[PDB]
Design a protein around this ligand. Structure first.
Ligand SMILES: Nc1nc2c(ncn2[C@@H]2O[C@H](COP(=O)(O)OP(=O)(O)OP(=O)(O)O)[C@@H](O)[C@H]2O)c(=O)[nH]1
Ligand SMILES: [Zn+2]
Lengths: 62, 62, 135, 113, 356, 440, 246
RNA sequence: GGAAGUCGGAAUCCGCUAAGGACUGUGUAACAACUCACCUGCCGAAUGUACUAGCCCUGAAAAUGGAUGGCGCUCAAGCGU
RNA sequence: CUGUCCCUAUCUACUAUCUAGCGAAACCACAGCCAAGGGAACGGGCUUGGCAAAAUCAGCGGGGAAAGAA
RNA sequence: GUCCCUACUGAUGAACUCGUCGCAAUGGUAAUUCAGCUUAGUACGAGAGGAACCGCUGAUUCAGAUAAUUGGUUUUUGCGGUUGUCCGACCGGGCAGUGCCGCGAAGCUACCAUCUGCUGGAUAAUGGCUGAACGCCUCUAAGUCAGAAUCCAUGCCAG
């Protein structure tokens, strides 16, 4: 569940990627960190199992 | 093994309580309440609407 | 992998540690001496015991010299101590008997003399195959 | 579920009522109570003990030949479910029960003539 | 032994108290929480299990159930509570017309010699147009109270015991606004409530009772042995207990005349065993037949309440398909369900011939 | 089966820290000067011992986990010898062993001195001395621990090559197509790149042919050099070429693609034929798709024919890019291996005395088919739905719902309620789902 | 068609399965993976019954039958027998027998023309089997093992017998039956063919540990997978088997 | 075998200069590529290296619940004058 | 079979709540709730804290007993 | 060669008119581990091998109850058999500190029998968001997210 005021979009710009936009920087970044932390691997090999949902680009909407 | 007080165990218990037992007990209470309601329906001062005074301590005796 | 059967229901335990038991197969051994059981919960001063369908670790007392050299796993097939099956029927056998089984769960003999406990037949597929009477 | 009959005495051995014993020969002995269990373990003869259906039928205290008694049998070739068949079976059960009771009254009176 | 149930003092009151009602939220409909009953004994059932994942699936399993006779329960009062920094406080109570002789016996100790003068001025307080006062108490409950309970008493007159004194308790109303629940209680004054309206079938509930007393018992049986944490000799038994998670399997209507009948055995018989419940008698009223054992002696008062929390097991969602109910005599090693069965089995007797 | 079960070999500092933490934490460390002298002696003696048994257990585990080169198949023996400098390996193990002996001697001597100690200060100094002398020993055994850790990792990563199994050993010169053929034939990941020494170790894959499991071993690549002067990696191939009963597949490239002359390949073969003493030898000419065999000078054609007219070495043709004959090469070489192996098994079984061996009797029994003397067949009723039925395929769109998919959609594994009356064939189908009366 | 499966995690499929040319019996437990594979291989061509005998999941080792009948022990309860009848059509007759040897699947092997039983059954049991199955019933032993129902499989197209039977013994059973007979192993060298296989005239289900050579043996023996599968392949193409099971 | 500054051994020069090491790290089978040192442009005014002296933390601790005397105290009700 | 152990059986001996009546002795500075501190391996009264409610019955497994030192 | 006070465990209790129905300060506190099905012969792996979260079901230990059933116990001295002896015989009984033997209800017991054992917040190691110190940088300084069978409570026992 996200912080209030953040928009989430599965864009048809690149495949298998997500956009998290908003007005409050703390809320945007904390939501991104929460999703990144919830999708994490357990009791496996980090060097071998590369799968996850990871932040790629940070910037401004306009 | 995971204890009965584990956070993960509590989370799974919460999902189970919210998704299945919730609706089941809701319908059960609906039926029971319907039956119980059926069997049950089977001047201000001189009227009581104005609630007045009926008939150790907290303050120091002055 | 420990030869502990899975899903076994609670049953009265009648063959403790230090037990003399008969051998029901054609493996050539005559009696077994249960000295240990598998999957037990170690509590103080209690001698562990096993019911039918439970793996125990036993030594042969009399029988074939070749078998009288090593300690062997074995699952007990008949229990004289009464126990109740979930259909509420209490029952017990005439004696206490078992069969020598390898750790994987395969018997050394080819035929079991006498009847076979229903719990043991359910738990071990090989016994259900080499069983003559199942009750 | 089936209303079993006690091996030693013949009273109905209902479920959860009693103990059964498995001989090495491969056939099971179902007893309805501890009395019967202990009597068989002491190896007394049910045909001789006088509180058993075996003794009653051997000394001729109960009827053994009656069409009412050949209606009852364990069935070894099963049949298909049929609602009217089962209902008519229930009604036949009632009729045969009352006929058996009334013929039993007559048998008792003819004996104690 | 256990360091939780350690003040091994005897229960101060023979009835037992709920000590916790389920948390109230107005979203649910208006309902009562608990009820009483009297233990009769236990019988044997076989159930066609439908439990996916167990080897007893789609099979018949013999199971032990307990009988609690629950005659209709008369509602006679309404208690309104307020919430304070020191806890919950009983703001005020409102009784009803014509309290019965059994609840008045509960109020008195030497009932035979007393002048039976309980609630006479309260009956006058109703009948003499002080309905204004009673309504002002009701509006005080509506306006100031947050927890509302119902005073309810059982019917020993119907229950087959030598006693004649009833058992009052406060049963909390849940699921609604304070005004709605006050209206519910006021409308429920002087009408019996039925156990099938309080609970229903297949609902896992909680049973509160006083477990049997054994007097001064040594450590061997008191603690199961071979500072306050050391096993000591003293009172064992007669202890207030609240046992949780007991599935109610059947509610028998008492007047059905076929209470023990299932869909598979078309035998018209009641729950009462052949010869009656040992040391209790006959269950001639509505009865609750519950899985497993229950704290308490036969004919002891019971408290049946709902679970404090939503369930987490498939065991509570399960439906129960009974097959037959044991009716044989508990007085010994019985084998006959009905006197007709016994007569048909044993034939006619010397007494039958001499009488006829 | 393998050598991956070697426990980690600590460095000297890690070993010292482990042993001293262990004797610090698993054992009491509070004594007072006002205690009995016997108690003080016992306390410090127990400390020194516990340290000694901890060190002995660790060193013994190290010494006994690693394989002993004496008892391996000489394939593995020579592979380890060339890949680990068995001399250095054995001297490192010997240093570990002599350190174990030194530690146990120190413990014994200092326990005796502690027995004859007379004060708490003396006991403390004797304990400190003993535990520090053992530490100095470890700091001396810094380097062998590092070498053993490295070799432990390399052995744990080595593949499993079974010395005695039906094997296709592919060898040849750098850049002939060995790795390409290996990936085209089996599913083992062997790198294919255009540079010289891509494959620098031994790779192994597996095959199925006539329901038998075959091994395939890709070797690095040998270079025109008298065995004595070759490289280590090159000798990895030669050890493989020497100590494995197999079909050798020597890859020649008709085209000059690799960078070595056809005369150079012919030379190498004649040089390593003594390695291919009695193994089943197949030369495969690849790269036909760039230079077919017929497009050559008859002089080289005739040299190849002269090599063919010798022993039972066989010339085959393939192309590891168009996959024209890879399956044919598979079939031919594996079939020849199978027939040779069954032949030698039959000969080994056939004793000179004439008595058929027990295993041979058993295999003849498993081969024999028993048939009725009259030769009459028996009539069977196969329903025509079998012949007009469609095979189940798990990827098809319009499949049938199927019970497993039903339970998965309608719940899980311990959730779905199976309806046992759905398959009941009655007279009136509404009579289904009826509580059958049972007792009266 | 020969396929590979396991009940829950057990490779002994003959313990939990029973195939004839007119019906299939499948044990009841947990998931419907066993039922799913059996129905996918028998796509409503013949009825399949999810049953239990004696409150037990060893229906394969407790039951025996052919295309013309089904046979159950006396320990079978009436509800289970009623389930069997309502699940199977009227063209199959089902009988319960009061025999001491309750392991019917272990003591009686059956093809839809003949039969072979433990020498220690009763005469009354002999004629009632001969009547209910409508087959010629004989009294022999295999590999000197008294449990033919356990240590052998058979069909109207073939038979797999204990791997350690003598040549003359194999010839004797071949003369007795009339079906081509080969000795082979199941489930990676297991001796319990009856428990490790269940084989009908057009389908076989073995355990997942059954090796490819012995699966090929099975197919060639019972003419599965259409193709040829004569057993003549076993005689001619012998290199595979002599290599694999030496 | 391959080793182009960076798997290894030794020296480590010259020009161009603003400055650039026969190279501090990342990387390739080798390269390539990136990066550091150093240098120039923008910015604009104080920085940064080592010690010393106060106070504070750690600088080692077991086993019935307890002790600046207790409460409690934080621009003190602690510390120095 | 035993120079082994345990259980069952028998015998021997000591084993016993309340009421009526009868009715001692041992022993006794005064007492008796805990924790820390009380330099002299010393606390029971002192300091300062915990606390702390009449009168009784039963059970009892803890304290009110110990060194003297080469 | 030296039966009493007190603690703990329970049980009564005058004063507040008796009684009923409640609140909860404080004090204790509880659950534990293993295995099987599905995930799945899937992920991964040259091969051999081979998991995990969600869902489901049992078992071990511990704890609190209970007498449907089963087993044990017998002064039910309830019924029957039988030894010695006696009441003249039969019947009916007595004595042998419960003569002995069999069955034996009621009651009491036995993981020898059966039932039940529950949910929120705050944290440690640690992983982070924004962002100074220190124009780079930084989980920390201000602010703040998550997170162990841990802590504190509810559920539970005493009042
Ligand atoms: N045209 C053609 N090229 C081939 C064929 N087989 C291999 N190659 C070439 O071989 C090159 C790669 O070398 P590898 O196949 O790995 O040869 P190798 O014997 O394993 O030796 P390494 O190259 O060191 O691994 C590719 O670039 C191909 O062009 C073939 O059949 N036809
Ligand atoms: Zn009976």
């Amino acid at each position: 569940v996200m912080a209030p005021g953040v928009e989430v979009e599965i864009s048809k710009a690149q495949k298998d990627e997500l956009i998290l936009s908003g007005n409050s920087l703390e809320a945007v970044s904390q939501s991104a960190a929460d999703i990144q932390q919830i999708c994490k691997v357990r009791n496996k090999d980090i060097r071998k199992f590369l799968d996850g949902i990871y932040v790629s680009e940070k910037g401004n909407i306009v | 093994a995971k204890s009965a007080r584990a956070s993960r165990i509590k989370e799974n218990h919460q999902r189970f309580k919210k998704n299945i037992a919730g609706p089941v007990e809701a319908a059960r209470l609906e039926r029971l309440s319907a039956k119980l309601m059926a069997i049950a329906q089977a001047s201000g001062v001189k009227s009581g609407k104005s609630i007045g005074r009926k008939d150790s301590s907290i303050v120091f005796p002055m | 992998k420990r030869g502990a059967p899975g899903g076994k229901l609670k049953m009265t335990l009648g063959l403790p540690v230090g037990a003399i038991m008969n051998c029901a197969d054609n493996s050539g051994a005559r009696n077994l001496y249960i000295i240990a059981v598998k999957g037990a919960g170690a509590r103080l001063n209690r001698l562990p015991a096993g019911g039918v369908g439970d793996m125990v670790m036993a030594t042969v007392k009399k029988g074939k010299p070749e078998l009288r050299k090593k300690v062997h796993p074995a699952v007990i097939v008949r229990q004289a101590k009464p126990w109740k099956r979930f259909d509420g029927v209490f029952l017990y056998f005439e004696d206490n008997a078992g069969v020598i089984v390898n750790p994987k769960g395969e018997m050394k003999g080819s035929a079991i003399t006498g009847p076979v406990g229903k719990e043991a037949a359910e738990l071990w597929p090989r016994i259900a195959s080499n069983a003559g009477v199942v009750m | 579920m089936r209303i079993e009959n006690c091996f030693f005495c013949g009273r109905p051995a209902w479920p959860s009522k009693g103990i059964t014993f498995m001989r090495n020969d491969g056939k099971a002995f179902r007893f309805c109570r501890s009395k019967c269990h202990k009597n068989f373990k002491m190896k007394r003869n049910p045909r001789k003990l006088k509180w058993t259906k075996a003794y009653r039928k051997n000394a001729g205290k109960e009827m053994v030949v009656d069409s009412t008694l050949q209606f009852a049998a364990r069935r070894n070739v099963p049949v298909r479910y049929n609602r009217e068949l089962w209902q008519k079976t229930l009604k036949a059960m009632e009729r045969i029960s009352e006929i058996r009771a009334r013929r039993e009254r007559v048998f008792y009176k003819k004996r104690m003539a | 032994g256990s360091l939780a149930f350690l003040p091994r003092k005897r229960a101060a009151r023979h009835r037992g108290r709920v000590k916790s009602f389920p948390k109230d939220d107005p979203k649910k409909p208006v309902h009562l929480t608990a009820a009483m009953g009297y233990k009769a004994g236990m019988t044997t059932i076989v159930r066609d299990l439908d439990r996916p994942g167990a080897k007893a699936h789609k099979k018949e399993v013999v199971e032990a159930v307990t009988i609690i006779d629950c005659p209709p329960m008369v509602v006679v009062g309404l208690v309104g509570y307020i919430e304070t920094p020191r806890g919950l406080r009983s703001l005020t109570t409102v009784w009803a017309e014509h309290l019965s002789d059994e609840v008045k016996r509960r109020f008195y100790k030497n009932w035979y010699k007393s002048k039976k003068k309980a609630f006479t001025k309260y009956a006058k307080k109703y009948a003499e147009n002080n309905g204004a006062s009673i309504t002002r108490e009701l509006e005080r409950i509506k306006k100031y109270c947050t927890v509302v309970r119902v005073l309810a008493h059982t019917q020993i007159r119907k229950t087959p015991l030598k006693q004649k004194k009833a058992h009052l308790m406060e049963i909390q109303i849940n699921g609604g606004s304070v005004a709605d629940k006050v209206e519910f209680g006021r409308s429920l004054f002087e009408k019996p409530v039925t156990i099938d309206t309080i609970f229903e079938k297949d609902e896992m509930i909680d049973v509160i009772a006083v477990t049997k007393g054994h007097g001064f018992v040594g450590v061997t049986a008191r603690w199961g042995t071979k500072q306050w944490t050391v096993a000591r000799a003293g009172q064992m038994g007669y202890h207030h207990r609240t046992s949780v998670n007991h599935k109610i399997y059947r509610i028998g209507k008492g007047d059905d005349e076929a209470n023990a009948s299932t869909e598979t055995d078309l035998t018209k018989k009641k729950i009462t065993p052949m010869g009656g419940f040992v040391r209790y008698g006959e269950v001639n009223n509505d009865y609750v037949m519950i899985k497993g054992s229950v704290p308490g002696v036969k004919k002891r008062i019971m408290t049946l309440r709902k679970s404090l929390f939503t369930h987490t097991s498939r065991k509570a969602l399960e439906k129960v398909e009974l097959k037959w109910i044991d009716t044989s005599s508990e007085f010994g090693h019985g084998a006959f369900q009905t006197a007709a069965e016994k007569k048909q089995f044993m034939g006619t007797l010397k007494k039958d011939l001499q009488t006829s | 089966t393998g050598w991956k079960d070697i426990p980690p070999v600590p460095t000297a500092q890690e070993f010292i820290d482990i042993v001293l933490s262990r004797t610090q934490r698993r054992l009491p460390t509070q004594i007072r000067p006002g205690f009995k002298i016997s108690r003080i002696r016992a306390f410090y003696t127990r400390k020194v011992k516990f340290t000694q048994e901890t060190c002995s257990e660790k060193f013994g585990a190290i010494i006994s986990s690693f394989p002993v080169l004496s008892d391996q198949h000489p394939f593995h023996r020579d592979l380890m010898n060339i890949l680990y400098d068995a001399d250095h390996f054995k001297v490192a193990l010997g240093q570990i062993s002599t350190a174990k002996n030194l530690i146990e001697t120190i413990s014994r001597d200092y326990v005796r001195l502690l027995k004859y100690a007379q004060s708490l200060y003396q006991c403390k100094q004797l304990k400190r001395a003993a535990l520090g002398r053992m530490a100095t020993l470890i700091k001396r055994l810094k380097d062998p621990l590092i070498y053993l850790d490295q070799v432990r990792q390399h052995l744990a990563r080595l593949p499993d090559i079974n010395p005695t199994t039906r094997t296709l050993l592919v060898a040849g010169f750098p850049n002939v197509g060995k790795s390409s053929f290996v990936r085209s034939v089996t599913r083992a990941d062997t790198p294919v790149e255009p540079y010289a020494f891509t494959t620098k170790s031994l790779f192994v894959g597996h095959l199925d042919y006539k329901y038998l499991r075959y091994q395939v071993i890709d070797t690095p690549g040998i270079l025109d050099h008298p065995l004595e002067e070759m490289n280590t990696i090159e000798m990895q191939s030669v050890t493989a070429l020497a100590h494995l009963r197999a079909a050798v597949l020597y890859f020649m490239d008709i085209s000059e693609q690799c960078g070595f002359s056809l005369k150079a390949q012919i030379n190498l073969f004649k040089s390593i034929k003594p390695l291919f003493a009695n193994k089943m030898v197949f030369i495969v000419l690849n790269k036909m798709d760039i230079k077919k065999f017929e497009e050559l000078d008859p002089e080289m054609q005739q040299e190849i024919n002269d090599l063919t007219k010798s022993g039972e070495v066989e010339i085959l043709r393939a192309s590891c890019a168009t996959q024209e004959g890879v399956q044919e090469v598979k079939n031919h070489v594996c079939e020849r291996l199978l027939v040779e192996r069954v032949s030698q098994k039959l000969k080994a079984g056939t004793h000179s005395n004439g008595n058929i061996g027990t295993r041979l009797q058993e295999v003849m029994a498993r081969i024999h088919v028993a048939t009725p003397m009259d030769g009459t067949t028996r009539e069977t009723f196969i329903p025509e739905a079998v012949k007009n039925l469609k095979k189940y395929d798990k990827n098809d769109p319009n499949r049938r719902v199927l019970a497993r998919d039903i339970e998965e959609a309608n719940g899980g594994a311990g959730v779905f309620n199976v309806d046992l009356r759905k398959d009941w064939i009655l007279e009136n189908p509404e009579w289904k789902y009826d509580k059958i009366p049972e007792i009266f | 068609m020969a396929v590979r499966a396991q009940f829950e995690n057990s490779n002994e499929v003959g313990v939990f399965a029973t195939l004839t040319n007119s019906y299939c019996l499948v044990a009841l437990g947990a998931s419907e993976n066993f039922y799913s594979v059996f129905e996918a291989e028998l796509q409503d061509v013949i009825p399949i019954c999810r049953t239990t005998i004696a409150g037990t999941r060893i229906i394969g080792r407790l039951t025996a039958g052919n295309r013309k009948g089904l046979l159950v022990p006396t320990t079978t309860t009436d509800q289970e027998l009623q389930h069997l009848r309502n699940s199977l059509p009227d063209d199959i007759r089902i009988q319960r027998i009061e025999e001491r040897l309750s392991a019917l699947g272990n003591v009686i092997v059956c093809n839809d023309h003949t039969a072979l039983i433990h020498p220690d059954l009763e005469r009354e049991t002999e004629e009632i089997i001969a009547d209910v199955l409508g087959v010629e019933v004989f009294r022999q032993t295999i590999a000197d093992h008294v449990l033919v129902g356990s240590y052998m499989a058979l069909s109207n197209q073939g038979g797999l017998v204990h791997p350690k039977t003598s040549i003359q013994d194999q010839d004797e059973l071949s003369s007795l039956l009339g079906v081509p007979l080969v000795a082979g192993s199941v489930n990676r060298g297991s001796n319990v063919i009856g428990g490790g296989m269940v084989v009908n005239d057009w389908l076989a289900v073995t355990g997942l540990d059954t090796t490819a050579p012995e699966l090929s043996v099975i197919e060639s023996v019972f003419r599965l997978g259409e193709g040829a599968g004569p057993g003549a392949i076993n005689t001619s193409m012998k290199n595979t088997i002599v290599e694999s099971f030496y």
